[PDB]
Ligand binder design. Structure first.
Ligand code: HEM
Ligand code: HEM
Ligand code: NA
Ligand code: NA
Lengths: 713, 713
């Protein structure tokens, strides 16, 4: 069946904005996951998980009689798809159970791990999500094997269809670098927003870069990919040595024995894949990665034996039974036990990427410290494992259950507690009038609140107006945010705040974060009034102000908007056309196509563009909230052509006279070009639409203001 | 960006079930188009349309100073994509403004037509849909040019994204037959459900079959394609001669002058396409089809000149200025006016497909009769134009506005008016008790009501339980409906009905159509009772019984289910795997994936399978409403393999012993294999899900029972 994508493969794709509708969701419209989870007997779930660890199923037998190593891998792959660039991937939506991640090569045999958990999922039903269960199981595996975890939060709601993510452009699984779709260029520069070295890997190649078993070069890939998943050197070493304290790899025979991944397998495989024709096809015969390495002398107990081996032997390049590069300890005794035969022992073995931890000089220092001081190792690993498995869950207000750690961590972008009475409706009316009386303009008010709120992204639930981080480094100096105009607006708002707070009794006060949003609300009200329409814009107080010392400046970098079509802004020249970047931003803000359309059309006539650009400002009454953008965009009396100097800027001239009426960008003109978006523009450009336009604009404005308000959830 | 479709191109696609969500719809969730339309000043819209006919725009000038011909083409193409096989296409969703149809080669320059209508659409806004406007404009073009139409109904709601339609498998526009994706095999047999001869045409090739200018062979294509759009010989001749009484074709120079279709054009074209480099690119220089034919001596007035010319000359094959085959009248004077130059006249010309109306023996007889009796021609064309433009609108209860014809037509599948008091709640309880006391089983009751209601399709809103056509030819004879079991159940229901109706006072009576649905509901209640649950099933009376004479047997054949996964039925072997056919049927029934899943699992345990097959009947308590199907389907203690005899039937055996537990088809097991469907099955197979399964089942059952109930809508 030939499709629109076939005929027009470069057309913009809006269907990413209409995922996760009530149609595809089996739960009722009123289902609340948090309310279900908060009644779960978590202690009972954990006891069930603890028993499951040592209850081997014959269809996929447990190594050493213990599934713990398998479940740790499962939970570290669930979390391990995360990219800091866009916040996409991670464990937060349980996406490992859908395409494509259910069938990535690096997730081979995790299908079996997830099937082992079905009887527990079934028992507890909607009270525990698959997304939560995947991570909980990893925690319980660690606990069962004598490791003390840092804690656990529930609250990851299940999703019901694949997330639309750019995983790269290669058309072959695990394709080595330098092909026609290479994810690398220059001196090994990995294209953003990717965080893995080959299509279908979690981070790096365990043999070494594109298969080359050099631990030093492997270390460069490890550091780069882990940084791109928000982990530094100490966290990276702790995680890799911590993980490889447990269990084993599987490569008993050649990879050509292994059949179709789950999405390609026959209907009779019932959701499983990688069926193997080698010997029994499982257990002692298992093939997963093709490597056959067992790290420690007690693979089912926490120890400091990984670093004892790493530093206590010299290592020789060798091959698994599948033909993959791996390393074996020169001259060592057989001290490592066998997974199934108590009469058999083995010499210590290592991956190329394990030896990276000793042969990269910076790693070596940390590894040595962890070797000599295993208590430091345990604490680092516990903290890293928590961060790994929670880094995409958003603010601490989303954390549920009885095991949530009390310590507040810097990477959580923490918001202080509110410890005073909030402002009421009369107060908010008073403060809006004061803001408007100050002389701040519609454009200043709307711009500033947009700048503060529009850093939110639903992918990892970072960003938003809560915290008032727009006043801090680095937000206050981002080019998009117009640092000098921003400073003058914040100065004026801070004086209003000081005067209001100074007059109160009984502890009542307003945060700057709330006042920034409320001021933006006053700007939108005033613009409606400028148009001849009285409206109230909803506002919910309760935000608090975070300090500079509670703000990690390096971590905040990835939230900078380098493309924001809502402010007609592009920081530099990109490969991806600007309209595709606009749809990407709308996806992160959680906007539908109709929401994106309304919002952009209003922002244009309110004066939100960076630098007061005239591009797309299709009105002769700026700072009035009207549907002018749409009426003027759709007027056939105007003809559009790209400029000589710049093919991405367009002039709109009267078709009869030739007079210049307007200019615009690709972001502006796409609403008059794309067949689906133009249909939406038509609704708001109709003669009957002014009331609808205003109401829908206020709604989507308020939605954006509240994106990070999980305290009200 | 590589996608799941790239990696696994033959995977099932569930996103066709979750199209048209509230997310993509710009209107509020309460918007009711009918209520908006009923307040439209239709007379005002028509005056504006009359004005527009002769208001030529410079950017695409009007032939002969009158856009009427262009708009009639526009309206006939809007309606002309309809296929009787699945009810898909037609005018009823305004889909000509979206991909792919906005950019089909046969729809070249209709973009110009639709843009000419924007000012009217804008003026009247949501009170007239594009879908209604395209057809009304065709009606007004006809009226402006002196032809009296049979009438017009509003009520086609606009849609906001492309419909998922199989238009064929060719990967080249207009590809001639016999290629690697040929829509033809054997003795020119067109694959169902297609209704056109080449990809991107409405019906047939105007030069002749695969470009061969033989009018006799072209006639075979015309008959076959028009039959597949529900039109017989009389209606087909009326429509083609009626249409081609107006306007002209356009092929003033070579097709290589014409640039990208609208979906491929540059952003600056603002939704238009086919920009031409030939001379002025438009008007006298226009190129659309490549043919250059003007049929009558008065192209902007209704006349009887089409058949005068067709019969009054002999015809000579020749070529247009673009090189396409067409026909010119031997020895004729230049009597046909020129569209732009009053000093120029032209000889009469015809398409290959026009000569088909004279050289096919069956058409010649009709054409002659129309020539000799022009008033018969006019009436037939008026009636056929109404049928063409309304054939996909469904029951007459959906028809809005003040121009709706009073005459009831056979192709509207008419249902008599109800002229008596309906049964009340007390009556319905009485009739349910009598049905249960008769001996009829859960399985019989559920099967029969399913059979009656599940003929509905949302594509053209035909079918459903209203009319009790299940008791008539041909429904009573269809294999899926189990003719002999069906006869015994209807006999019993008719005796209950006779006795209840004979006891009533006033005129109160129950229809068989209502009783069949009510009895189905009682079966569902009894099944819930068998399972230990107290359940009420909603029921709405008001269906009526249609007669055999109000039921066209040939038209009814396209509604026969040859595949119904919901009854585990496949009438023979098909190219498309059965699960794809299941999702296709769920789309026609307007079901989401969660609705499809719930429904299918319940029907299996209630005994709805054709022939009492055990396939998918995964319960030991048949005729009890439980979630057994899911709990057993997801049990890892069972292993599944295709049988020796039949690769589409599967045996489910105990994994430990090897004992046979169950058998199933692809339709059954896809719920345990497809990663999204399995996630749905898991919700319903959990330990907390029994009451959720029952309540969700009753909701979807009631939905299906009410799909055709536009009298209550
Ligand atoms: C450079 C980073 C990493 C590389 C290249 C790497 C590579 C691999 C490979 C190739 C396997 C064998 C899969 C099989 O054949 O069954 C594996 C196993 C495993 N990995 Fe890692 N890994 C890395 C980091 C991590 C981290 C961060 C953790 C958790 C904190 C982890 C935990 C494990 C565990 C527990 C297993 C054993 C699974 C079992 O017993 O069945 N790995 N690793
Ligand atoms: C065998 C069926 C038919 C074929 C092959 C056919 C073919 C065509 C072609 C090729 C054109 C010229 C397009 C252009 O170059 O601008 C055309 C024009 C048109 N057709 Fe037909 N047509 C058919 C049936 C119909 C029907 C059923 C109607 C309406 C009842 C219709 C009404 C028109 C009109 C009004 C035009 C003139 C357009 C104008 O003046 O701009 N045709 N047709
Ligand atoms: Na994420
Ligand atoms: Na249709």
């Amino acid at each position: 069946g030939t499709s629109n994508r076939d005929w027009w493969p470069n057309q913009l794709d809006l269907s990413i904005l209409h995922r996760h509708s009530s149609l595809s969701d089996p739960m009722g419209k009123d289902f609340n996951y948090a309310q279900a989870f908060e009644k779960l007997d978590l202690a009972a779930v954990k006891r069930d998980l603890h028993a499951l660890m040592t209850t081997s199923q014959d269809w996929f037998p447990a190594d050493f009689g213990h599934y713990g190593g398998l479940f740790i891998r499962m939970a570290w792959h669930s979390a391990g798809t995360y990219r800091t660039a866009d916040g996409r991937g991670g464990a937060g939506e349980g996406q490992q159970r859908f395409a494509p991640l259910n069938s990535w090569p690096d997730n081979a045999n995790l299908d079996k791990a997830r099937r082992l958990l079905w009887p527990i999922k079934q028992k507890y039903g909607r009270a525990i999500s698959w997304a939560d269960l995947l991570i909980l199981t990893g925690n319980v595996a660690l606990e069962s094997m004598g490791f003390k975890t840092f804690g656990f939060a529930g609250g990851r709601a299940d999703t019901w269809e694949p997330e639309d993510v750019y995983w790269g452009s290669e058309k072959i699984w695990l394709e080595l670098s330098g092909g026609p779709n290479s994810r690398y260029s220059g001196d090994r520069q990995l294209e953003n927003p990717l965080a893995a070295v080959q299509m279908g890997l979690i981070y790096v190649n365990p043999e070494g870069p594109d298969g080359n078993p050099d631990p030093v070069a492997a270390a460069r890939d490890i550091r780069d990919t882990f940084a791109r998943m928000a982990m530094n050197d100490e966290e990276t070493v702790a995680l890799i040595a911590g993980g490889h304290t447990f269990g084993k790899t599987h490569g008993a025979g050649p990879a050509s024995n292994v059949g179709a991944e789950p999405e390609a397998a026959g209907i009779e495989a019932q959701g499983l894949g990688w069926k193997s024709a080698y010997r029994t096809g499982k257990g002692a015969d298992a093939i997963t990665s093709g490597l056959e390495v067992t790290w420690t002398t007690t693979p089912t107990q926490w120890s400091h034996n990984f670093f004892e081996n790493l530093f206590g032997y010299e290592w020789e390049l060798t091959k698994s039974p599948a033909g993959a590069h791996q390393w074996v300890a020169k001259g060592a005794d057989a001290v490592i036990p066998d997974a199934f035969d108590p009469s058999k022992k083995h010499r210590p073995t290592m991956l190329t990427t394990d030896l990276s931890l000793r042969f990269d000089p910076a790693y070596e220092k940390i590894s040595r410290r962890f070797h000599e001081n295993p208590e430091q190792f345990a604490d680092a690993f516990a903290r890293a494992w928590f961060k790994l498995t929670h880094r995409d869950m958003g603010p601490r207000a989303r954390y549920l259950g009885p095991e949530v750690p009390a310590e507040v961590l810097l990477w959580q972008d923490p918001i202080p507690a509110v410890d005073h009475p909030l402002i009421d409706a009369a107060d908010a009316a008073e403060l809006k009038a004061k803001v408007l009386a100050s002389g701040l303009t519609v454009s200043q008010l709307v711009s500033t609140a947009w700048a503060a709120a529009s850093t939110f992204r639903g992918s990892d639930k970072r960003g938003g107006a809560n915290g008032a981080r727009i006043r801090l480094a680095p937000q206050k100096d981002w080019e998009a945010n117009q640092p000098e105009q921003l400073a003058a607006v914040l100065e004026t708002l801070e004086a209003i705040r000081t005067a209001f707070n100074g007059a109160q009794r009984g502890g009542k006060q307003v945060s700057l974060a709330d006042l920034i949003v409320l001021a933006g609300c006053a700007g939108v009200e005033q613009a409606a009034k400028n148009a001849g329409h009285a409206v109230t814009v909803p506002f919910a107080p309760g935000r608090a102000d975070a300090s500079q010392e509670q703000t990690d400046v390096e971590s905040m970098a990835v939230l900078e908007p380098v493309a924001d079509g809502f402010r007609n802004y592009l920081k530099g020249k990109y490969r991806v056309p600007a309209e595709v970047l606009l749809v990407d931003k709308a996806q992160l803000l959680t906007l539908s196509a109709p929401e994106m359309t309304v919002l952009l059309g209003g922002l244009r006539v309110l004066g939100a563009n960076v630098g007061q650009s005239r591009h797309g400002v299709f009105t002769a009454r700026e700072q009035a909230l009207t549907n002018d953008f749409f009426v003027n965009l759709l007027d056939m009396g105007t003809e559009w052509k790209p400029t000589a100097a710049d093919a991405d800027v367009f002039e709109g001239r009267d078709r009869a006279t030739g007079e210049l009426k307007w200019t615009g960008t690709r972001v502006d003109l796409v609403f008059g070009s794309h067949s689906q978006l133009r249909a939406l523009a038509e609704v708001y450009g109709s003669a009957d639409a002014q009331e609808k336009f205003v109401r829908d604009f206020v709604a989507v404005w308020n939605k954006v203001m509240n994106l990070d308000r999980f305290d009200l959830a």
